[PDB]
Write an enzyme that holds these catalytic residues in place. Structure first.
Site, PDB file in Angstrom:
ATOM      1  N   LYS A  16       0.813  -1.195   0.000  1.00  0.00           N
ATOM      2  CA  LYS A  16       0.000   0.000   0.000  1.00  0.00           C
ATOM      3  C   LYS A  16       0.855   1.255   0.000  1.00  0.00           C
ATOM      4  O   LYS A  16       0.619   2.165  -0.786  1.00  0.00           O
ATOM      5  CB  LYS A  16      -0.944  -0.046   1.192  1.00  0.00           C
ATOM      6  CG  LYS A  16      -1.361   1.283   1.755  1.00  0.00           C
ATOM      7  CD  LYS A  16      -2.250   1.084   2.978  1.00  0.00           C
ATOM      8  CE  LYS A  16      -1.632   0.141   4.010  1.00  0.00           C
ATOM      9  NZ  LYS A  16      -1.862  -1.302   3.713  1.00  0.00           N
ATOM     10  N   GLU A  24       0.995   7.826   6.571  1.00  0.00           N
ATOM     11  CA  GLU A  24       0.691   7.331   7.905  1.00  0.00           C
ATOM     12  C   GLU A  24       1.400   8.208   8.916  1.00  0.00           C
ATOM     13  O   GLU A  24       2.553   8.584   8.718  1.00  0.00           O
ATOM     14  CB  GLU A  24       1.154   5.892   8.067  1.00  0.00           C
ATOM     15  CG  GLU A  24       0.219   4.870   7.456  1.00  0.00           C
ATOM     16  CD  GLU A  24       0.569   3.461   7.866  1.00  0.00           C
ATOM     17  OE1 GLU A  24       1.736   3.213   8.246  1.00  0.00           O
ATOM     18  OE2 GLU A  24      -0.325   2.597   7.809  1.00  0.00           O
ATOM     19  N   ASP A  78      -3.434   7.483   3.397  1.00  0.00           N
ATOM     20  CA  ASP A  78      -2.866   6.193   3.716  1.00  0.00           C
ATOM     21  C   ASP A  78      -3.672   5.768   4.938  1.00  0.00           C
ATOM     22  O   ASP A  78      -3.434   6.248   6.053  1.00  0.00           O
ATOM     23  CB  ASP A  78      -1.387   6.304   4.059  1.00  0.00           C
ATOM     24  CG  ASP A  78      -0.704   4.958   4.109  1.00  0.00           C
ATOM     25  OD1 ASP A  78      -1.396   3.924   4.225  1.00  0.00           O
ATOM     26  OD2 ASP A  78       0.539   4.937   4.034  1.00  0.00           O
ATOM     27  N   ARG A  79      -4.687   4.945   4.673  1.00  0.00           N
ATOM     28  CA  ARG A  79      -5.620   4.401   5.660  1.00  0.00           C
ATOM     29  C   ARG A  79      -6.753   5.351   6.059  1.00  0.00           C
ATOM     30  O   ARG A  79      -6.641   6.577   5.961  1.00  0.00           O
ATOM     31  CB  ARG A  79      -4.892   3.871   6.906  1.00  0.00           C
ATOM     32  CG  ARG A  79      -3.785   2.861   6.605  1.00  0.00           C
ATOM     33  CD  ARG A  79      -3.298   2.168   7.861  1.00  0.00           C
ATOM     34  NE  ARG A  79      -3.934   0.873   8.016  1.00  0.00           N
ATOM     35  CZ  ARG A  79      -3.413  -0.266   7.583  1.00  0.00           C
ATOM     36  NH1 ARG A  79      -2.244  -0.274   6.973  1.00  0.00           N
ATOM     37  NH2 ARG A  79      -4.069  -1.398   7.749  1.00  0.00           N
ATOM     38  N   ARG A  82       9.421  -6.392   4.432  1.00  0.00           N
ATOM     39  CA  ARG A  82       9.196  -5.163   5.178  1.00  0.00           C
ATOM     40  C   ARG A  82       8.931  -5.440   6.653  1.00  0.00           C
ATOM     41  O   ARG A  82       7.838  -5.879   7.026  1.00  0.00           O
ATOM     42  CB  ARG A  82       8.010  -4.393   4.592  1.00  0.00           C
ATOM     43  CG  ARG A  82       7.679  -3.096   5.327  1.00  0.00           C
ATOM     44  CD  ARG A  82       6.196  -2.744   5.211  1.00  0.00           C
ATOM     45  NE  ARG A  82       5.327  -3.758   5.813  1.00  0.00           N
ATOM     46  CZ  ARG A  82       5.124  -3.903   7.120  1.00  0.00           C
ATOM     47  NH1 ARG A  82       5.724  -3.104   7.991  1.00  0.00           N
ATOM     48  NH2 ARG A  82       4.314  -4.851   7.561  1.00  0.00           N
ATOM     49  N   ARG A 140       8.906  -3.381   9.972  1.00  0.00           N
ATOM     50  CA  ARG A 140       8.932  -2.076  10.623  1.00  0.00           C
ATOM     51  C   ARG A 140       9.602  -2.066  11.999  1.00  0.00           C
ATOM     52  O   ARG A 140       9.847  -3.121  12.594  1.00  0.00           O
ATOM     53  CB  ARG A 140       7.510  -1.524  10.731  1.00  0.00           C
ATOM     54  CG  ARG A 140       7.113  -0.651   9.569  1.00  0.00           C
ATOM     55  CD  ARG A 140       5.712  -0.115   9.755  1.00  0.00           C
ATOM     56  NE  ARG A 140       5.426   0.989   8.841  1.00  0.00           N
ATOM     57  CZ  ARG A 140       5.245   0.861   7.529  1.00  0.00           C
ATOM     58  NH1 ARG A 140       5.316  -0.330   6.949  1.00  0.00           N
ATOM     59  NH2 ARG A 140       4.984   1.935   6.792  1.00  0.00           N
ATOM     60  N   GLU A 199       8.314  -4.197  15.154  1.00  0.00           N
ATOM     61  CA  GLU A 199       7.294  -5.084  14.633  1.00  0.00           C
ATOM     62  C   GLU A 199       7.867  -6.502  14.629  1.00  0.00           C
ATOM     63  O   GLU A 199       9.043  -6.700  14.320  1.00  0.00           O
ATOM     64  CB  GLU A 199       6.935  -4.626  13.211  1.00  0.00           C
ATOM     65  CG  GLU A 199       5.924  -5.476  12.467  1.00  0.00           C
ATOM     66  CD  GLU A 199       5.662  -4.961  11.061  1.00  0.00           C
ATOM     67  OE1 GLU A 199       5.196  -3.810  10.921  1.00  0.00           O
ATOM     68  OE2 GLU A 199       5.923  -5.710  10.097  1.00  0.00           O
TER      69      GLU A 199
HETATM   70  N1  LIG Z   1       3.893  -4.804  -6.458  1.00  0.00           N
HETATM   71  C1  LIG Z   1       4.698  -5.284  -5.508  1.00  0.00           C
HETATM   72  N2  LIG Z   1       5.240  -6.506  -5.636  1.00  0.00           N
HETATM   73  C2  LIG Z   1       6.041  -6.962  -4.675  1.00  0.00           C
HETATM   74  N3  LIG Z   1       6.425  -6.382  -3.538  1.00  0.00           N
HETATM   75  C3  LIG Z   1       5.883  -5.150  -3.401  1.00  0.00           C
HETATM   76  C4  LIG Z   1       5.017  -4.558  -4.360  1.00  0.00           C
HETATM   77  N4  LIG Z   1       4.668  -3.314  -3.901  1.00  0.00           N
HETATM   78  C5  LIG Z   1       5.262  -3.141  -2.753  1.00  0.00           C
HETATM   79  N5  LIG Z   1       6.030  -4.225  -2.370  1.00  0.00           N
HETATM   80  C6  LIG Z   1       6.796  -4.397  -1.111  1.00  0.00           C
HETATM   81  O1  LIG Z   1       6.426  -5.375  -0.151  1.00  0.00           O
HETATM   82  C7  LIG Z   1       6.901  -4.813   1.131  1.00  0.00           C
HETATM   83  C8  LIG Z   1       5.728  -4.124   1.852  1.00  0.00           C
HETATM   84  O2  LIG Z   1       5.233  -3.025   1.074  1.00  0.00           O
HETATM   85  P1  LIG Z   1       4.591  -1.696   1.737  1.00  0.00           P
HETATM   86  O3  LIG Z   1       4.131  -0.894   0.571  1.00  0.00           O
HETATM   87  O4  LIG Z   1       5.725  -1.058   2.446  1.00  0.00           O
HETATM   88  O5  LIG Z   1       3.486  -2.177   2.625  1.00  0.00           O
HETATM   89  P2  LIG Z   1       2.180  -1.709   3.190  1.00  0.00           P
HETATM   90  O6  LIG Z   1       1.062  -2.405   2.493  1.00  0.00           O
HETATM   91  O7  LIG Z   1       2.234  -2.139   4.587  1.00  0.00           O
HETATM   92  O8  LIG Z   1       2.005  -0.246   3.085  1.00  0.00           O
HETATM   93  C9  LIG Z   1       8.012  -3.773   0.782  1.00  0.00           C
HETATM   94  O9  LIG Z   1       9.290  -4.394   0.988  1.00  0.00           O
HETATM   95  C10 LIG Z   1       7.828  -3.426  -0.686  1.00  0.00           C
HETATM   96  O10 LIG Z   1       9.038  -3.660  -1.412  1.00  0.00           O
HETATM   97  C1  LIG Z   2      -3.547   1.346  11.653  1.00  0.00           C
HETATM   98  C2  LIG Z   2      -2.907   0.329  12.525  1.00  0.00           C
HETATM   99  C3  LIG Z   2      -1.702  -0.306  12.174  1.00  0.00           C
HETATM  100  N1  LIG Z   2      -1.166  -1.246  13.007  1.00  0.00           N
HETATM  101  C4  LIG Z   2       0.131  -1.883  12.677  1.00  0.00           C
HETATM  102  C5  LIG Z   2       0.111  -2.784  11.473  1.00  0.00           C
HETATM  103  C6  LIG Z   2       1.562  -2.723  11.046  1.00  0.00           C
HETATM  104  O1  LIG Z   2       2.423  -3.635  11.732  1.00  0.00           O
HETATM  105  C7  LIG Z   2       1.955  -1.318  11.395  1.00  0.00           C
HETATM  106  C8  LIG Z   2       2.084  -0.408  10.215  1.00  0.00           C
HETATM  107  O2  LIG Z   2       1.126  -0.830   9.235  1.00  0.00           O
HETATM  108  P1  LIG Z   2       1.402  -0.737   7.651  1.00  0.00           P
HETATM  109  O3  LIG Z   2       2.324  -1.827   7.264  1.00  0.00           O
HETATM  110  O4  LIG Z   2       0.123  -0.902   6.951  1.00  0.00           O
HETATM  111  O5  LIG Z   2       1.987   0.581   7.349  1.00  0.00           O
HETATM  112  O6  LIG Z   2       0.954  -0.804  12.265  1.00  0.00           O
HETATM  113  C9  LIG Z   2      -1.753  -1.573  14.186  1.00  0.00           C
HETATM  114  O7  LIG Z   2      -1.261  -2.417  14.940  1.00  0.00           O
HETATM  115  N2  LIG Z   2      -2.924  -0.946  14.524  1.00  0.00           N
HETATM  116  C10 LIG Z   2      -3.520  -0.006  13.731  1.00  0.00           C
HETATM  117  O8  LIG Z   2      -4.573   0.508  14.103  1.00  0.00           O
END
Ligand SMILES: Nc1ncnc2c1ncn2[C@@H]1O[C@H](COP(=O)(O)OP(=O)(O)O)[C@@H](O)[C@H]1O
Ligand SMILES: Cc1cn([C@H]2C[C@H](O)[C@@H](COP(=O)(O)O)O2)c(=O)[nH]c1=O
Ligand SMILES: Nc1ncnc2c1ncn2[C@@H]1O[C@H](COP(=O)(O)OP(=O)(O)O)[C@@H](O)[C@H]1O
Ligand SMILES: Cc1cn([C@H]2C[C@H](O)[C@@H](COP(=O)(O)O)O2)c(=O)[nH]c1=O
Lengths: 313, 313
Positions: free
Chosen positions: A17, A38, A114-115, A172, A174, A177
């Site tokens: 995302k 976020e 973002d969310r 990924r 965090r 995490e």
């Molecule tokens: N289209 C995709 N294909 C594969 N991996 C992806 C793609 N888009 C994003 N990623 C990734 O997967 C991991 C999580 O992506 P991220 O965008 O950071 O997550 P989130 O959904 O939590 O916001 C990152 O390491 C990033 O490289």
């Molecule tokens: C929005 C939200 C995220 N999270 C956690 C999920 C992920 O480990 C982290 C960041 O989320 P993200 O990967 O979507 O950016 O925050 C919670 O635990 N509670 C929440 O309400």
């Protein structure tokens, strides 16, 4: 009458995302599109210390029998209030500028969030409830506080097969995490039930009418978030929900009914996802603003928020 | 077009609020007046176990150095979410029936509420913040979630000299409640600041405009709830509030601005208080309902709530 377009990218964490939205706004399509990230900084510093770590640590201790469900629940509830604070206050100051829907005509400004507030006030709390770290009464306390759904609330949920999801989640990791495939499954189920709920309600579903079916594209009550609330703690002696809890569910329905959910398939190239999101955008509902100065104000809020709470762009 | 009248009796605990309202409704003035009691049962059983005791016990342990401010804060935040849940859900299901204000003409129905959502979402959390058991970031997280102020929100606060208050508080000792004169003073101050805030805002006050005065019938910013938020944790390096926190304060203003507060003097006979309340009622703002069936529905909700959550009448 200028129109505004608001898009909320949501769904389970570690799906791409953040990556896909950054590409979307990376097109440098001028001021007509602002991305709200976020509030990572609020979570880690401003609201409380390392809240994300607090959450994962707490679930772990509970899983290792080092704390009781009671203590887990209390910390988790408090952590979730911190997670959603910036989402709630933003939506709250943005409300006075959102006017009625204007169909689906280029919008003067586009906001990619973002969310949505429901992630912190409904989706995560519900998932933790399934993990044993949150009580059903608490989840409903959050539900009862979900702000009224504004017009033009387009929510883009995601679609990605479990295996391909795990892999991405594994990359990924965090700050603070911990990899928890159980939590991943729970959050994936909550978001799926959510989508089914919007659909169910929009097809004329009435939870009060279908409730008995639980006892024992057309989703039934058993495929909606309402199933999670057949908890014994919520049921009165006569086998029916206490009115307080029934009302909360009423509010839940009132809130989800007016949302426009869209499903984005993340099972593809990041660029591909960006394109599909961009494409999906064309069919999203726009709205009018209440004042001429609204567009500039809304643009400033979003810019400020991103600057002050975004860990980065 | 039938009108509805809603009156919220609030203010610090142990002042005679429960006594005076029961007398007010004890006049048996037919169905045109329904009293909604405190959801004592939700607090003690349905929402969580003995929540009031949990609160007083927690503050005590903290005062005895048996726990840290951090642990106090987490339990307190969780307890307050439980305290206000029934208030929030009620207000939330009642919103769709409240129409615009209709001046000050006998109302088809009158609702006497025991406390307003702000007691649990603002007043107590703020007071605990002063007691060291709650963080300013948490209090503001609650503020940001205060539901929009409905038309016709008449809030009746109380007036009673400290000494006469203590005496009454000393007589009425609820289950799991511990006499805490410090908490009493803190809650008395919070409610006073609240009244001053409504006034200040209604006289054209703008907190952003007066904020600098803090640094260093016409209330100034220093006599309002805004003073409580000059906390170091909230201040950015440049000596100004972080925008997230500034917005929360904006929402606080938007919420309190449209309330009609009335001050009832409890420094008299219970009958006398009942009379004064009854008298005060004549000048309160009424509203229209959105549907003809609204009055019956609203009457049913209130009756159900009282029956299911009232420890008694
Ligand atoms: N289209 C995709 N294909 C594969 N991996 C992806 C793609 N888009 C994003 N990623 C990734 O997967 C991991 C999580 O992506 P991220 O965008 O950071 O997550 P989130 O959904 O939590 O916001 C990152 O390491 C990033 O490289
Ligand atoms: C929005 C939200 C995220 N999270 C956690 C999920 C992920 O480990 C982290 C960041 O989320 P993200 O990967 O979507 O950016 O925050 C919670 O635990 N509670 C929440 O309400
Ligand atoms: N007018 C009054 N004068 C003296 N005591 C009163 C009066 N009205 C109520 N009380 C009482 O003081 C105590 C607290 O009153 P109560 O109504 O229960 O409090 P609360 O304000 O918390 O709702 C009770 O013991 C009750 O007898
Ligand atoms: C509404 C509310 C009451 N209380 C406490 C104050 C009293 O000791 C008790 C009952 O209040 P009461 O005397 O006004 O009925 O509940 C809280 O601690 N937090 C709250 O949010």
């Amino acid at each position: 009458m200028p129109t505004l377009l608001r898009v909320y990218i949501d769904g389970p964490h570690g799906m791409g995302k953040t990556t896909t939205t950054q590409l979307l706004v990376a097109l440098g399509s001028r001021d007509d599109i602002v991305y709200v990230p976020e509030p990572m900084t609020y979570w880690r510093v401003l609201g409380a210390s390392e809240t994300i770590a607090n959450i994962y640590t707490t679930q772990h201790r509970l899983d290792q029998g080092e704390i009781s469900a009671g203590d887990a629940a209390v910390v988790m509830t408090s952590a979730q209030i911190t997670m959603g604070m910036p989402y709630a206050v933003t939506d709250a100051v943005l409300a006075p500028h959102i006017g009625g829907e204007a169909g689906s005509p280029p919008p003067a400004l586009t906001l990619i969030f973002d969310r949505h507030p429901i992630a912190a006030l409904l989706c995560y709390p519900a998932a933790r409830y399934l993990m044993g770290s949150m009580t059903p009464q608490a989840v409903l306390a959050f539900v009862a506080l979900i702000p009224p759904t504004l017009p033009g609330t387009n929510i883009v949920l995601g679609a990605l097969p479990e295996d391909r999801h795990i892999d991405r989640l594994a990359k990924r990791q965090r700050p603070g995490e911990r990899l928890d495939l159980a939590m991943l499954a729970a959050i994936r189920r909550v978001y799926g039930l959510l989508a089914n709920t919007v659909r169910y309600l929009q097809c004329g579903g009435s939870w009060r009418e279908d409730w008995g079916q639980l006892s024992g594209p057309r989703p039934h009550i058993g495929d909606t978030l309402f199933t999670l609330f057949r908890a014994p703690e919520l049921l009165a002696p006569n086998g029916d929900l206490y009115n307080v809890f029934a009302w909360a569910l009423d509010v839940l329905a009132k809130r989800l009914r007016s949302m426009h959910v869209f499903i984005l398939d993340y099972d593809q190239s990041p660029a591909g996802c960006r394109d599909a999101l961009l494409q999906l955008t064309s069919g999203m509902v726009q709205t009018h603003v209440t004042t001429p100065g609204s567009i500039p104000t809304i643009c400033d809020l979003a810019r400020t928020f991103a600057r002050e709470m975004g860990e980065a762009n």
